[PDB]
Structures are given as structure tokens and as C-alpha cells.
Design a binder for these strands. Structure first.
Ligand SMILES: [Mg+2]
Ligand SMILES: [Mg+2]
Ligand SMILES: [Mg+2]
Ligand SMILES: [Mg+2]
Ligand SMILES: [Mg+2]
Ligand SMILES: [Mg+2]
Ligand SMILES: [Mg+2]
Ligand SMILES: [Mg+2]
Ligand SMILES: [Mg+2]
Ligand SMILES: [Mg+2]
Ligand SMILES: [Mg+2]
Ligand SMILES: [Mg+2]
Ligand SMILES: [Mg+2]
Ligand SMILES: [Mg+2]
Ligand SMILES: [Mg+2]
Ligand SMILES: [Mg+2]
Ligand SMILES: [Mg+2]
Ligand SMILES: [Mg+2]
Ligand SMILES: [Mg+2]
Ligand SMILES: [Mg+2]
Ligand SMILES: [Mg+2]
Ligand SMILES: [Mg+2]
Ligand SMILES: [Mg+2]
Ligand SMILES: [Mg+2]
Ligand SMILES: [Mg+2]
Ligand SMILES: [Mg+2]
Ligand SMILES: [Mg+2]
Ligand SMILES: [Mg+2]
Ligand SMILES: [Mg+2]
Ligand SMILES: [Mg+2]
Ligand SMILES: [Mg+2]
Ligand SMILES: [Mg+2]
Ligand SMILES: [Mg+2]
Ligand SMILES: [Mg+2]
Ligand SMILES: [Mg+2]
Ligand SMILES: [Mg+2]
Ligand SMILES: [Mg+2]
Ligand SMILES: [Mg+2]
Ligand SMILES: [Mg+2]
Ligand SMILES: [Mg+2]
Ligand SMILES: [Mg+2]
Ligand SMILES: [Mg+2]
Ligand SMILES: [Mg+2]
Ligand SMILES: [Mg+2]
Ligand SMILES: [Mg+2]
Ligand SMILES: [Mg+2]
Ligand SMILES: [Mg+2]
Ligand SMILES: [Mg+2]
Ligand SMILES: [Mg+2]
Ligand SMILES: [Mg+2]
Ligand SMILES: [Mg+2]
Ligand SMILES: [Mg+2]
Ligand SMILES: [Mg+2]
Ligand SMILES: [Mg+2]
Ligand SMILES: [Mg+2]
Ligand SMILES: [Mg+2]
Ligand SMILES: [Mg+2]
Ligand SMILES: [Mg+2]
Ligand SMILES: [Mg+2]
Ligand SMILES: [Mg+2]
Ligand SMILES: [Mg+2]
Ligand SMILES: [Mg+2]
Ligand SMILES: [Mg+2]
Ligand SMILES: [Mg+2]
Lengths: 51, 96, 84, 54, 64
RNA sequence: UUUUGUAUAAUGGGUCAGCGACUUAUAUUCUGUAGCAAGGUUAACCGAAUAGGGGAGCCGAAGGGAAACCGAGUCUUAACU
RNA sequence: AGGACCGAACCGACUAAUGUUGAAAAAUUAGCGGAUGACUUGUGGCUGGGGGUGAAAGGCCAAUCAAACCGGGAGAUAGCU
RNA sequence: GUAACGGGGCUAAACCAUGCACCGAAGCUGCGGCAGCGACGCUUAUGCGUUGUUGGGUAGGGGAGCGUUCUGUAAGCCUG
RNA sequence: GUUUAUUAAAAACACAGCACUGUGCAAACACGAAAGUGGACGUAUACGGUGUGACGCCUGCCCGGUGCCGGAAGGUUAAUU
RNA sequence: AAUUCCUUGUCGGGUAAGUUCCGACCUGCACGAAUGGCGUAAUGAUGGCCAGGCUGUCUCCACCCGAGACUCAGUGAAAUUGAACUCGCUGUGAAGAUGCAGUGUACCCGCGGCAAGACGGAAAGACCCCGUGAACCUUUACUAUAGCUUGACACUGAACAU
RNA sequence: CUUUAAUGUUUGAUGUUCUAACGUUGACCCGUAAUCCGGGUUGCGGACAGUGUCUGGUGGGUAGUUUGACUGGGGCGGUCUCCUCCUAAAGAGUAACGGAGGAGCACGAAGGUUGGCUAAUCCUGGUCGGACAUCAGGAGGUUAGUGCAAUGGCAUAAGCCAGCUUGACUGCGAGCGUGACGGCGCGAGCAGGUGCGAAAGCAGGUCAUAGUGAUCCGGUGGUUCUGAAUGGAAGGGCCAUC
């Protein structure tokens, strides 16, 4: 709906990415999270990117 | 496959996979067919001559099925673990 | 007055029944992980060896026999699994 | 069809024994005449009852 | 003459050891952000055609 | 005949005699039965031709996997209790 | 003089009755309209099917016309009887 | 067209209650017969002592047969 | 005057007249894969199309919408490179 | 009003009485100016209304003349038809009975008539609905396309000036 | 370095002359007794016109077709998927053009955890200030709240604050529930690696039930799985995703 779709790409260099939805207007700041990366099997910083 | 106009099964389920062309030229041989060759040597074209495998086969694997009761020399084929053990129990040899 | 008049209705909507209610009744013998009751909100509560899922579905966590009892100061209804 | 109907009048379902009207402060015979006159306007058989302790 | 295979059913179903057919689960092509990961994890493995649809697929796919 | 339902005032037939409607081909599955049996069987064709030859080929004896590949295991997964 | 007038042949077809397994798959009887004209008629020719021709009605195109007839695709298809 | 007992007709041949008989179906029983299935005889060829049950039937499913023309048996057999 | 031969002859169609519009001649337009033919051995006082329909008095306002005519500046625009 | 619904508008004329007609009013549901407006002499197998004459059109039929119908002789069809020993009523019933129940009546068979019934005969309802039916027709429905039209390249070249 | 002379030089375009292609339904001569045709002479037009291929526009002139269903006959009207209550007959399920309402999301926190707290309303007193603002006390008892409908829940709170946070994790999953099926839901526990807490423990989203669409065809990123002679690659597959 009003929320767009973004992908959180791993910062561990795997190329793996989670996907999620974000309210662009109300939270313009990018989103960073510590999410598990199965490729390197460690929790690493995941940062926002367009789908 | 018609179901009254409802989307049939073979259309609502997704396709999957591809067909391997090398699998059409690879084949398998049982331990029982080992004694069915001639000369005691299990060459690929020896199996073809004994009509164990088709003419246009180009790979072959011997598997633990049936039993082997003669010395053989499997030359040029790939052999499973159990088939290798069974052949070497029968006193056979497993060339490269 | 010849044929008829006319007039639409605003209703005629409803939803698929969810098949809630007690699945395995008291005295029954369940396998671990058997759903004992699907419900909306903890109408029944999770007693011994009984777990409550997100949709408040009660499932037996241990093999045995179901047992309903009124328990607690609020006279609530607890499902327990007697060890069998 | 095409839905339900529109509300036209309001009724009160009556079961036997229901004490419809009550009256006080009048003589008994005049009460009987008044109740006869009232019952003549109702679609249900009635009877005249009095107050009792229990 | 020779019966003709329904090519779509041939692509979508494969035959196993006792006669059942393996198919791929539906609901995994797109719209995936909103699907819980538990659901996708369950939908990845191949499944078995049920008894009711066995007759349909068998008739569609005679040279299976 | 068609129907929830026909004496129906629902359809068909004036009567007789003759003709008139689930077949054939080829594939595939199940059953029965006959042969052979981890084997079974040949097709075109050759043939003193319903014999005999022809085993090209097909089905089966091994499955798992999308596939490479592995193999009484295999696939999933870094790995399975 | 006149797409003038009255009125037979000739051309039509407004009303009525008959007939409606008819004398006739459109006629007969009594009336009726034009009757030197945009008339009528004999003979021969030309225009053809999504096409002709039409003072126009979807009219006529061999008793058949919102697309002739004959042969073929063809045993079209018919969840209908 | 009687035409709101089926009719005759009925003052009980109506209604109620008490009873005892009788009538009354293709129901049940009696006699005789055929068949399906099951057990049991245990024979095993369909006789298989016997016994118990079962046998309305549309669409439909299963089992078993009759008859017709033609071929082999058949240059046989029947027949001026 | 014409018209639905065969249930409608009319207020319908046609008509002389009027208007708009196209057409400079190898004319427009029509039949025709094309040759060619009609238009016409005519030529704008001619020919085609459309509408109205003798005659008399007339035919008012709207160019926004849809068409048609005229314009080429600017925007968007194909093949090709 | 060939337009006007309400509506038989209202007023006047014609009639003893006029939803039609004629003349008006205007409140034009929903006239109107070349898909022409308003008149218009003549014309019309044109539509509406009125009057004179005339009459069996009618009050209300009567008689007569012919052709049939009717009888005799000859010839000789047809549509239709499950079989019929083919009554009335009341009820019942696939809901309107010759055929069921109850009951009344009724000797067997023709001939001339009538047409109330046999849901009489004809035509696999034309109206209505359905069919993922058909056809023709329309359009600013979709997709095309003939035609008309635009440009590039080709047949297609030269000289010169910008 | 958003200017022009450049030796002009290779070139589009435009314009103007030409004639030799081409046109000629101009004239004359010839085949030839022939207003067809062809040949010749000539006049005019002339690289235009016209035709072929490609291409844009227009195109009911023509053609093929589409134009849903339910329905108290069809049309018109309304509805078509999902959630909640009732009908629904005390398990589940259950129809109507039956009676009432909602959804096509929201949230990086409104999620996890740890610690803490408890509402509506009314009365009394109180500066502006009241019927309703903030303060204090009491009565009350959850008559509140639950991001949004209704139901069922909720005090151990699922309601309200605050700290740290990413479990709104990856691979599975005993066993169930629910469907004709596609599918949908619940789920302890196992492995890895995390958050909170001293710890027990809790956490693979939200108090639960709506917030949504299968397949095909493709797009993006990984993956050397395959990659038609060989090595690559194109492509295809598998995984995530639009
Ligand atoms: Mg559909
Ligand atoms: Mg071979
Ligand atoms: Mg409903
Ligand atoms: Mg995918
Ligand atoms: Mg019926
Ligand atoms: Mg009967
Ligand atoms: Mg009858
Ligand atoms: Mg009948
Ligand atoms: Mg019949
Ligand atoms: Mg008949
Ligand atoms: Mg004259
Ligand atoms: Mg005529
Ligand atoms: Mg005459
Ligand atoms: Mg005359
Ligand atoms: Mg005249
Ligand atoms: Mg005359
Ligand atoms: Mg003449
Ligand atoms: Mg033809
Ligand atoms: Mg018409
Ligand atoms: Mg004709
Ligand atoms: Mg046609
Ligand atoms: Mg054909
Ligand atoms: Mg034919
Ligand atoms: Mg046919
Ligand atoms: Mg009477
Ligand atoms: Mg008896
Ligand atoms: Mg029987
Ligand atoms: Mg014989
Ligand atoms: Mg006519
Ligand atoms: Mg006529
Ligand atoms: Mg006109
Ligand atoms: Mg005007
Ligand atoms: Mg304009
Ligand atoms: Mg303008
Ligand atoms: Mg223009
Ligand atoms: Mg009037
Ligand atoms: Mg008067
Ligand atoms: Mg008057
Ligand atoms: Mg008037
Ligand atoms: Mg008009
Ligand atoms: Mg008008
Ligand atoms: Mg006009
Ligand atoms: Mg006019
Ligand atoms: Mg005339
Ligand atoms: Mg008179
Ligand atoms: Mg006679
Ligand atoms: Mg009757
Ligand atoms: Mg009768
Ligand atoms: Mg008679
Ligand atoms: Mg009659
Ligand atoms: Mg008669
Ligand atoms: Mg009839
Ligand atoms: Mg019919
Ligand atoms: Mg069309
Ligand atoms: Mg077609
Ligand atoms: Mg419908
Ligand atoms: Mg509608
Ligand atoms: Mg219930
Ligand atoms: Mg119940
Ligand atoms: Mg929350
Ligand atoms: Mg919380
Ligand atoms: Mg919620
Ligand atoms: Mg290669
Ligand atoms: Mg690749």
C-alpha cells in the first residue's frame, strides 16, 4: 500500500538479502539491522537497499 | 485433465527442473550382469557387445545389485563402494 | 401494480467457519503435539504439559490423557495432560 | 425475495396466564364492566382476576 | 495411434518408486516479502500427489 | 420417453413386413487365463511363406536428486535427533 | 399544346364477397386506377452472389433471398432433443 | 346436479369409557419347490449329509446363459 | 408517377426546384490485382456526391464537442543511419 | 398538433346526447426553421368529421329465382388414427376426467343438422428464457485489412549557387 | 573550447538550370485497308511523376469475433474474494436477493526481553479555568484499554511507561487440525548463531481471528548444477526476490 518494499543487503559481502516493507515518508532514514547471514553463518549488519 | 473449467492440476502446479542430456547417455550395470560379458574383462564396448547396455551409451556404473561369482576386471567404468567391495571379494580387479 | 417493484439488500456477507472448538475431549489419549482445542483467546488455559500457541491453540506437549479441571481463584478452565 | 420487509407495527406475544391490564381504586363491578369493554377490543380470550396474598 | 503425453503435466510431475508422483509446491513464484519464512521453508520441498488427483495425473501422463 | 411426480388432457407411434443405433484401427492401464520366468519378447525384413531365422529394439530386475552426481541408498542442510 | 380530360384494347391491383385439402402454390365476380406517356410490349443482348439491380420494400435475382442454386470440405459442431 | 358420511340409510348403524369375539395384507405361520451367501460336512469335477440366513428394485456394477448367420470338426451325419 | 411479384400503394420513394461540396480533363468518382472501360467522343451554364423537396413569405443564435478546410512555429513522433 | 403524458385540458361550434371533428386559449411532459418552419389553388383507389339523396346496413326480417346441400345410378379422395365394448354429475387426481370413486341415467343401429368437449386437426411456439448457438446490421467494442496518405531506399542522372 | 577565414576537402539539405533515364490519354510518318499496339521523327514535362520493398497515420469500406454469472421468469437494480456476530437446532459443518457490521492495511516500533505501573466515571477542594485542561482526596471497580469491525479473551495482565535491543533470525521438525484438491494453520523439540535477564527463562513478529491471488511469461542477485565436437559463453536449472 503506502509502504514500499526494500531489501536489506548483507554488509558481510555475501550478496544475501532479506526483504521487508518500509514507510518511506515517515521514516526517511535508512534502516540498519543485525540479521543472521546463512551464507557466512554469522549475525552481520544488514543495510537497506531498493528492491 | 479437464476439471469443469477450474484451473487443472497440471496448470496450477509450477513446472520444475530441466532434462539432463548426459543422463540419457549414462547407464548402470548390475553385479549380476558382470558374469554375462565375455573374456572376463568388463569393457564398455564389451558390455555393448554383450547387449548389457545400449549402443549410444557412453558412461556406465556398476552397483550393488545381485551378486558376482567370478573374477572380473572392471576397466573404464565407475564402481560404487558396495560394488567395489563385492567385486574385490569375488577376486576381481577395478582398473581406473 | 403490474409486475413487481424492486429493491436491493445491503447484507449477504459472511466468512468461512473456522472449525474451532474442542478437538480431543476429556479422557482421550493424545500424542505429543496434538491440538486439544482451537479457540479465540484463552477460553481454555494451558495446564500441565500443555502449550498455548500464538492463536491460543492448546496443544499437548507430552504423551498422555487429557484432563479438564476448574482451577485457580477465577474458576478458570485448565487443560492438563496426565502422564500416560 | 429481494430482502426482508419493513417494520410496520409492534406486537407483544401473549401466553396464557399473562395479566395484561391491571386496575385499582375502582369498584369491582365497574372494573368488570371496564375490563369487558377493553377485552372486546382484543383478539385473545381473557378472564377477570383479583389480587391475592400469594 | 500412440497416446500423446500431456506435455505440461510431464514437465510438472515426476514418477517415483511405488507409483506416486512428485510435484513442486505452489505459492513460491512471487509475492514473497509478505509470506512468512516458515511458510516458504515448508513450500520448498517436493510433495506427493494425493489420491484424489492421482487418477487425473495418471490419465494425463500415461508414459510416465 | 421425460420427470419430484403421469390414466394423464405431457411426448411418440394408423397397422404389418423388411432395414435401423456402443463398431473398427492403434496405443495405454486393470482383470482373467496360457507360456516362459530374473528374465520375457521380438518389429520391419529373409524364408520350400501360419515353421525357422532376425534380439535392432521394448518392458523388468534400483532408487534418490532440478542437475552434476551418488547408489540400497539418496536428497535437504554447515550437519542432521 | 399538354408526364391535359372522359373512356375500350393494353398495363395495373384500391374495396368487397367467394375460395382458403381452391377451378388456381395469389385466382374468379362486381366495382377500381393509368390509358401519347417517367407509358406499354415482342425479339435478341448485357450486369451474378458479400456480388448484381433497385423512383428504396431489405425489394427482385427461375413458386427459393438480412446474402441464390448445385457439387465438395462433410459423417462440420450440437454441454441439446 | 343431491354434492361438506362414498352411498343406502341410521336416534343408534353417533360420541365417550369398559371389555370379549370376529373380519382384515403379497405381514407371520403351515405344505411344496427354486436360488444366493456363510459356517460346517471336508467333499475337493460344482454332488459336496446338514444347517443359518437371504432373494422389491430405477441409474448402475458383478455373474450366468438362449438364439441367429458364417468357419472348422464335415468328401461326416440327416434328407425326393 | 414508383413501391414490399404472393396480407402493407401510403403521409413512404421519385420528382422539377433549392443549397452545400468535390472535380482543370489522363477530371473527380466507379468497375477492374492490371490493361483498360464508364464519366464522355462531354469540360465548370459540365459531371459526381449529399440533403431538402413545386410555389409564396422566410430560413434566427451557437464553431464549445465530432467532423472538414487552412496554418506552420513549437512539443511528441516510424522506417533508415 | 401525424408531436400533448396528466387528459375526455378549458372555452366556443356542430348533436337530444360528440373521448372523434372544427375554431380558439398556451400550462409546448417532449414544435421550430433545408434529418426545413408557416401557409398553399389544383391533384389523391390518402386519413378524420359533417350534411343532402339513397337504400334490407339496421328496426326485423319475409318471399321468390337459380348453384350446392338432400335421394337415386356411375366413378371415387383427404387431412387424422396406441387400442376401444368412446354417458351425465359430484369429488379425487401431474392440480380442468368417456375411462379413478360414489351415484344418476341409458334397448341395438343409422340419416339430416349444430358445433359446447374430445386441453379437436395442421405447424418439434413466432412470444419468454436458455445455448459460453447462428446470421446479417451498427458504432468513438477488440484485432486486423483493402483503399487513401507520409517518409527512406531503388528505377535515378548532370551542372551550379547557397 | 556552446563564433567564424580555414587550401577546400569529403558530405546531407534547399534552391536554380539541363537532358540522357522515365512519362506523354500532343502532332506527324510506317507495319496497315487498323482513332489497338509497336517502331521512327518531333513537341512538352523531366529526374518530377509513377511503380516495388520497408515504414508512420487514417481506415466499420471490408472481415473475424467478444459482449459473465447469480436472479423467486429475464431485464433494470444489487452482489461476486476475505474477517466478525446471529440464523445454526449446547461437538464440527450448514442455505436464502436472510438480519447486522468491516478488510484490500499499519508498525523498525505499535516487535523481543527485563524492570516497573493499573482504568472509566462521579463527588469534594482548588489561580486564570468553565459541564469538560492541570493539582489533591475519596467513592467505584475495570461499567476502561486493546492501531482499525465484531466476537472470544486479557490482573500472571494481551492494557500503560521506561532500559537494552533485532528471534520481524538460517536449516529442519515429532505430532496434529482443516480442506475434494491446490493449499492453509498450530507446533514442542533438534542444529547454528544472536538479543534481553543475576538467573530460571523468554524470543523464528504484533491478544487471536481480515489486510489478498495459482500457473505461465519474463526482470534483478547469487549458484560454475547443466552448458548439444572441445574450452568458454548464450541459455536453462536451483536458491532469494520483483
Ligand atoms: Mg474462470
Ligand atoms: Mg540392445
Ligand atoms: Mg449466504
Ligand atoms: Mg523463482
Ligand atoms: Mg414438470
Ligand atoms: Mg396414477
Ligand atoms: Mg383422453
Ligand atoms: Mg397421451
Ligand atoms: Mg417418445
Ligand atoms: Mg401422434
Ligand atoms: Mg393523360
Ligand atoms: Mg406493380
Ligand atoms: Mg376485374
Ligand atoms: Mg378501367
Ligand atoms: Mg386522373
Ligand atoms: Mg382514363
Ligand atoms: Mg421498347
Ligand atoms: Mg460461391
Ligand atoms: Mg425495415
Ligand atoms: Mg422467387
Ligand atoms: Mg454469410
Ligand atoms: Mg473437416
Ligand atoms: Mg457435404
Ligand atoms: Mg451431421
Ligand atoms: Mg345447487
Ligand atoms: Mg393372506
Ligand atoms: Mg433383486
Ligand atoms: Mg458349417
Ligand atoms: Mg403486397
Ligand atoms: Mg395491396
Ligand atoms: Mg424528404
Ligand atoms: Mg439553420
Ligand atoms: Mg469545431
Ligand atoms: Mg475552433
Ligand atoms: Mg489539419
Ligand atoms: Mg382533449
Ligand atoms: Mg354541447
Ligand atoms: Mg365540447
Ligand atoms: Mg383543434
Ligand atoms: Mg421535426
Ligand atoms: Mg426537432
Ligand atoms: Mg436542421
Ligand atoms: Mg417536409
Ligand atoms: Mg397517383
Ligand atoms: Mg346522412
Ligand atoms: Mg352416390
Ligand atoms: Mg372434473
Ligand atoms: Mg364430465
Ligand atoms: Mg350424425
Ligand atoms: Mg365442438
Ligand atoms: Mg359446420
Ligand atoms: Mg390442437
Ligand atoms: Mg420446440
Ligand atoms: Mg463487423
Ligand atoms: Mg470461427
Ligand atoms: Mg442469466
Ligand atoms: Mg445489471
Ligand atoms: Mg454449532
Ligand atoms: Mg447440534
Ligand atoms: Mg502491540
Ligand atoms: Mg508487548
Ligand atoms: Mg489485533
Ligand atoms: Mg560447447
Ligand atoms: Mg549461465
Amino acid at each position: 500500500g503506502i509502504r514500499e518494499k526494500i531489501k536489506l543487503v548483507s554488509s558481510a559481502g555475501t550478496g544475501h538479502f532479506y526483504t521487508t516493507t518500509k514507510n518511506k515518508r515517515t521514516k526517511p532514514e535508512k534502516l540498519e539491522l543485525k540479521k543472521f547471514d546463512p551464507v557466512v553463518r554469522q549475525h552481520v549488519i544488514y543495510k537497506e537497499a531498493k528492491i | 485433465g479437464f476439471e469443469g473449467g477450474q484451473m487443472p492440476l497440471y496448470r496450477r502446479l509450477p513446472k520444475f527442473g530441466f532434462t539432463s542430456r548426459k543422463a540419457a547417455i549414462t547407464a548402470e550395470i548390475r553385479l549380476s550382469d558382470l558374469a554375462k560379458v565375455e573374456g572376463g574383462v568388463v569393457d564398455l564396448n564389451t558390455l555393448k557387445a554383450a547387449n548389457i547396455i545400449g549402443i549410444q551409451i557412453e558412461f556406465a556404473k556398476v552397483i550393488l545389485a545381485g551378486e558376482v561369482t567370478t573374477p572380473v576386471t572392471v576397466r573404464g567404468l565407475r564402481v560404487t563402494k558396495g560394488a567395489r567391495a563385492a567385486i574385490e571379494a569375488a577376486g576381481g580387479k577395478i582398473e581406473e | 401494480a403490474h409486475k413487481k417493484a424492486g429493491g436491493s439488500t445491503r447484507n449477504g456477507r459472511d466468512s468461512e467457519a473456522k472449525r474451532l472448538g474442542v478437538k480431543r475431549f476429556g479422557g482421550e489419549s493424545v500424542l505429543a503435539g496434538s491440538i486439544i482445542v482451537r479457540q479465540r483467546g484463552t477460553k481454555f488455559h494451558a495446564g500441565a504439559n500443555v502449550g498455548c500457541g500464538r492463536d491460543h491453540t492448546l496443544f499437548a506437549k507430552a504423551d498422555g490423557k487429557v484432563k479438564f479441571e476448574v482451577k485457580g481463584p477465577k474458576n478458570r478452565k485448565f487443560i492438563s495432560i496426565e502422564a500416560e | 425475495g429481494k430482502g426482508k420487509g419493513n417494520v410496520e407495527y409492534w406486537v407483544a406475544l401473549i401466553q396464557p396466564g399473562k395479566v395484561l391490564y391491571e386496575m385499582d381504586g375502582v369498584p369491582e363491578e365497574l372494573a368488570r364492566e371496564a375490563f369487558k369493554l377493553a377485552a372486546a377490543k382484543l383478539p385473545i380470550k381473557t378472564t377477570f382476576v383479583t389480587k391475592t396474598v400469594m | 495411434p500412440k497416446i500423446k503425453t500431456v506435455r505440461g503435466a510431464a514437465k510438472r510431475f515426476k514418477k517415483t518408486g511405488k507409483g506416486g508422483f512428485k510435484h513442486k509446491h505452489a505459492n513460491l513464484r512471487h509475492i514473497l516479502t509478505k509470506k512468512a519464512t516458515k511458510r516458504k521453508r515448508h513450500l520448498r520441498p517436493k510433495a506427493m500427489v494425493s489420491k484424489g488427483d492421482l487418477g487425473l495425473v495418471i490419465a494425463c501422463l500415461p508414459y510416465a
